[PDB]
Design a protein around this ligand. Structure first.
Ligand code: FNR
Ligand code: FNR
Ligand code: FNR
Ligand code: FNR
Ligand code: FNR
Ligand code: FNR
Ligand code: FNR
Ligand code: FNR
Lengths: 207, 207, 207, 207, 207, 207, 207, 207
């Protein structure tokens, strides 16, 4: 396969739960192992913005997502917010790429300062110290100077700051076409195949 | 009225022509005077992403937009890319708020460095020196460190960096609901009434 | 009226509960709507430093403060520390000015880094991104370099850092005269009328 | 004794003359030698805010303060604003701790830039170059970014920035209880005994 | 005695519980008063890495450690994570030196930003503002740029960053010899006698 | 194979010769080519801390290490401190990963400033300019601000700063278990297989 | 005694050998233990500028200086430029204050960058990491921006930059009076008694 | 002639009046026009440190210095501290080199901040804006970080920071030989002939 075998997917409490669920579904279809983390505020966002009824405890959640995505047994792992025995908590774990989608401004702040107050924050801290891929998908507007400084610090270090800012150049016709644009970008960044967004200009020889 | 009487609306060559046209339409419905500027690359984007057939020369363009928006005669002014005799070129002009929507990374760069190579860039340079409102609506992903440094420099100065990153917390059902989210934010930032996006929590007394 | 119609008043766990209660009372007398937030540590400070017996749950608290201040029904709203459905949590809310009085060094840190770990921190993050008034009233001594850097970063962005450092130039005769000095400064900063602190030199024509 | 034998106490033209006089009295009661400096603006503040009738010339001033404090002959020395032959002017002097209480924003600026335009400013410049204790007690609100940058620069160098921001956690009952809080902090910082402010938690074993 | 009478010893959730317990034992043998704080994650680390069965509540914990160390009654105080009435919470407390051993990257971050979210973080914030000794003993590898910036900021302020990086120049023969190397360095830094690590070169006159 | 075929292993004069020798042995067992460099001070450290009798001249040294490690003929190359004709001296060489283990503070300084005064320093300078892997394993305590600034500068550029700070979370029972922890981290960072340190949480599915 | 029992005195190759020899003599008369280091260039300077015939090897040098100063046996220790077994090389040594007098611009550079290329440079690196007194006495003119940046970096960390810039305010009558001025300042900085330079203003009561 | 025809020589209140008087005498002997400025504190220093009885008012001072130096009529001009009609006050004046010898730390501060509070400070401000030579001769020890930052800022701009730190490499035999060393350096920097300090190595061909 091209791209990482394992992805840590963390969903935090920005608007855009749809982007996280669609990414999880795409990663499952590409036969990747997903270590799934979700914050308390992100549970509230998913309850507010979607009709997904996500169970709260990790084992129930894991069984639900496995069914939702049509995943294989053990393909999706779910770890709680204080589970320091989970792989993402330590850099001695097997290497994963990590994506925080959506990434709240609070989680962006914790990653930029190194707060490590829960497993999502520590997992990102570990990605940075081990030089493993870290993609943050903020959804906010305006972005204040506090947000922008945190994004710049992390981008300079090598994290990818990929805002949930879909393009329109393929004439999207639904909300799902816009969600898929951003998910396609995340997968492209990870090196994972995707067929939702064409390769710009691939057939253009000259003019 | 609340908010500015005159807005300079510049459209530059990022994806998201729909956001600029919808904003222009909203500003027209709120009886504002609009000084409309559009870059050459933005003309190509609007031809690519929309079915709007925008004439190229300023007088033809002005007549077309006036009809498209149902604007009053003289409500929309159109100025060419090198028209230094137009109001946005000088700080001795009557005060306007300015919005660049969509804002390409190239235009964001020119504003942050002060390049003033065309009327959009000079008009933003003038907004900054006169302390008049300047809102930039970038549409790009990932945002690189070059993009983020330019955004931070401008935000620290007092420009509003408002990415085209729509929220989902009112369960959008179409592309237009997502376009309207971002346009509502721009209007809110300008102080101009809008009824597309509710006031969060306005009826929530306690819990 | 002059000044904002709505103020978000957050009390956090620095010494000086008296300043927050007196400000709340003044804002009520000036017929303003107050969205009142209080941290867990600030509840302990108010229990320690005052004889105010503040109930813990938001509805009981709201009823108590309404009676304490002689407020109109619905004039004081109380929101809990994780209530993301409350107006201060989103920039799509109606605009309010925000004051954190007293502001602990921990809350000052969270605002400067963008931590957003509770509704007070997120509400300040939202004030900054929307360019709405934000006044922080720290009470600490010494101020360390960590405190001072956080204050400078926020002041450079446009927050007002208004320490609880009363002046003596009107020969104060009680603790309340010193509390009123600082509250008068906050109200002056907000643009809200106050008659506790005279306008310096207003009758001085020459010398 | 614990703490310094000699303190240079400079009073400059911020509000809060009471803090300087109370500190002088406490230092006298602790049998310390005080080198007392006072600016022209601080003389005006003491005339405005207190009923202390302080004579203007150094010898008359010295005799007055000696009587006011019940000091021993020669315990309080008074030096004029241009007296470069006084001990605080040179680092070849015997070592003293220095406190500027109250510290105006102008004096804070001079210390941070090294202006040395009078004996107070030079004495602080000398404390810094010799690594002798320097405590600044600003009284201002708001603190602007100019004030905060000057405070941060000096704090990073090792000066203590101790704002006149009294705490309330011992339920103060008078203006004097609040003045004594700040004076207690200064003495604590200097290492000089004081019995006005208890040692927090000293009898708390567990909970 | 040489060195401080009282030490605040905080253990946080980095690997290396052995260093904290050995330091506590050494400080007890040197007849020092210890104010002992431990984070929730550090309790899990001590359960994972050691055979010490540490009770969870502060009074039970205090009684256990008193027996483990052979301490005198009241020599070890234990305070909970939110106990703001404990001495380390306020700079008006009696002066202590503070050591965080081991220091997690999350606690290092909180100290560098001033987050004060629990008593360990606030106690370090207080050490810095009062200029009292603060020694951080991080255990992590690699150290990322986020870790290193937090360490540099604190070191520039005057905190000692003492990594758990034992030397081998006395030919250690057990894990305990390596634990004792680091503990000896901490005690040396505090000015507290220790006989585990010889004074390098003390008998070398020339060569 | 996974990871680099060739590693430049430089040992410099920090304590911890054991880490360098164990790493060399592991790299030999993984059939890697090693270009081995050692400073004069590191020779003294190895004589002081170990019972390894390392010959001083490069050919004798090469023959000794080949026997010590059970290496194949030509698998270990040894180059002298001024050998500019050796592969590590030029970026036109075949690509190698480089590790400095242990890394003295002096060598860390030379790499951060670009001093290139010997082949170890130049080889690191070359790794940086060619963007080849560079891992520094400092062993020092405390780390001063000079050390930390040099580490941050290099980490921001992309070098891995991996302190000799072993973890204890697998209950180490000997000095060798702690040496192996750090060596395992280096090999993990290089992408080279190792079976000394388990993959954290690899069998943990949920909780 | 007041001040340190042991001083590491390093002489490096700036002009002003007289200041180093006079300081060594004063420290001997004050019954201090001196660990004496001298660079190769400083030997040339002492041969050029003085009639002191200093033997080159450490034991001969030690015997010569002992006789020159009238020191007790073992009061002056001499260590060679690569003697890493000497006390100044390690922070596990007994604590000493360190003075580099004169300090060449090259040695100032090495200390500011952390080069540690000889025992003088490492000894200063160790003073900084252990927070032990470090006084640098540069003699150069002009001071370039490279010199000044190195001095500022070190001063901000807590080293004392004490240029060989004698004062004239006691009407010096010989070269020795000017040498003694600077030596008096060094001793004052160290806290060591000296009777060459009076305490400025000590008898001035008022004016 | 080589070097400038006109020099503005300002003496400010650092110790070292001898350097200023000797420089004035040398410039007179080299037939240069000198615009002489002296601060009030520098008058006190010259009264304290020398037997020069300098009259206070500019015309009397001018006549005295003309006689002291054996200058031609009009060769030395003297301007008062507030004389804005004097040539040094404006950059439209004829070009002069400027030297401040000695330069107090207060004058160094004013030049680095641009305070222009008297003619010496404004004259230096004018030298900088016109890119005319500016040489500052500070005499202070220690130099604090405030002094060093002011010196670095000015050196980076192109001012020469030439401390009064005489060399000894020509075996000086009197105070005057040391004064002449520094004066020779100033003249060398200005490009003005001097025969007090030989050209180092001028006759050394090889070795
Ligand atoms: C319905 C809804 C919608 C949003 C939010 C909340 C809720 C309930 N929050 C606020 C955010 O959740 C809050 O600051 C949390 O503290 C973030 O915590 P986590 O980073 O998820 O731990 C939020 N935060 C943000 O950065 N971007 C956003 O778009 C939104 N939108
Ligand atoms: C269809 C299409 C789509 C895009 C673009 C172009 C075209 C033709 N370009 C590139 C952009 O137009 C180019 O960098 C121009 O140089 C921008 O010039 P102006 O800032 O408009 O003068 C572009 N640029 C960007 O910053 N964000 C984007 O989303 C896009 N998308
Ligand atoms: C009685 C009392 C008095 C004080 C405090 C506490 C208590 C109980 N705390 C400490 C502060 O409450 C602690 O750092 C909290 O973590 C702050 O949390 P919040 O910012 O309120 O969420 C405190 N903090 C501070 O910054 N300034 C202060 O004056 C005080 N005084
Ligand atoms: C009655 C009164 C009250 C104040 C002041 C003045 C007077 C007369 N000033 C202004 C201050 O004195 C002025 O900026 C001086 O220039 C300060 O000079 P010194 O620093 O004392 O030399 C003043 N300055 C300040 O920094 N904080 C304050 O609280 C006050 N309050
Ligand atoms: C067994 C074990 C081992 C470690 C950890 C955890 C556990 C359970 N954690 C992670 C750390 O505990 C987590 O980031 C916490 O959030 C730290 O919180 P406190 O700083 O203790 O409040 C951890 N953190 C770190 O900085 N260095 C380390 O060596 C380790 N090792
Ligand atoms: C036995 C022994 C032990 C140590 C040292 C030396 C010796 C002989 N040195 C000092 C170091 O070797 C010295 O600063 C050298 O200048 C480093 O030179 P290289 O970087 O190897 O060229 C040393 N340096 C350091 O950074 N960390 C350490 O742990 C030690 N320990
Ligand atoms: C007679 C004589 C005089 C001086 C010098 C040399 C000699 C031989 N050198 C130059 C200095 O010695 C050279 O840069 C060395 O490299 C410094 O090395 P150390 O720092 O002593 O190891 C010199 N360097 C300096 O910084 N200030 C000075 O005053 C002098 N003067
Ligand atoms: C006898 C004597 C000696 C000195 C001083 C003074 C006196 C009277 N002063 C202090 C300096 O004069 C004071 O800070 C003035 O404010 C400087 O003002 P001018 O820069 O001359 O306007 C002083 N200042 C300094 O920077 N270096 C020094 O060597 C001395 N020495």
């Amino acid at each position: 396969m091209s791209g990482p075998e394992r992805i840590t997917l963390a969903m935090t409490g920005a608007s855009g739960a749809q982007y996280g669920l669609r990414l999880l579904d795409c990663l499952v279809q590409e036969e990747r192992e997903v270590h799934f983390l979700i914050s308390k505020a992100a549970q509230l966002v998913m309850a507010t913005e979607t009709d997904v009824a996500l169970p709260a405890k990790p084992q129930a959640m894991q069984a639900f997502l496995t069914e939702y995505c049509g995943a294989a047994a053990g393909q999706i792992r779910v770890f709680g917010q204080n589970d320091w025995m989970a792989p993402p908590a330590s850099g001695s774990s097997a290497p994963n790429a990590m994506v925080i989608c959506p990434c709240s401004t609070g989680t962006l702040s914790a990653v930029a300062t190194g707060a490590c107050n829960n497993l999502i924050e520590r997992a990102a801290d570990v990605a940075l110290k081990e030089r493993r891929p870290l993609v943050l998908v903020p959804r906010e507007a305006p972005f204040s100077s506090i947000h922008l400084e945190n994004m710049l610090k992390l981008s300079n270090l090598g994290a990818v700051i990929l805002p949930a800012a879909p393009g329109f150049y393929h004439q999207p016709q639904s909300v799902e076409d816009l969600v898929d644009f951003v998910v396609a970008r995340i997968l492209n960044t990870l090196g994972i195949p995707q067929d939702m967004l064409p390769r710009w200009g691939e057939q253009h020889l000259v003019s």
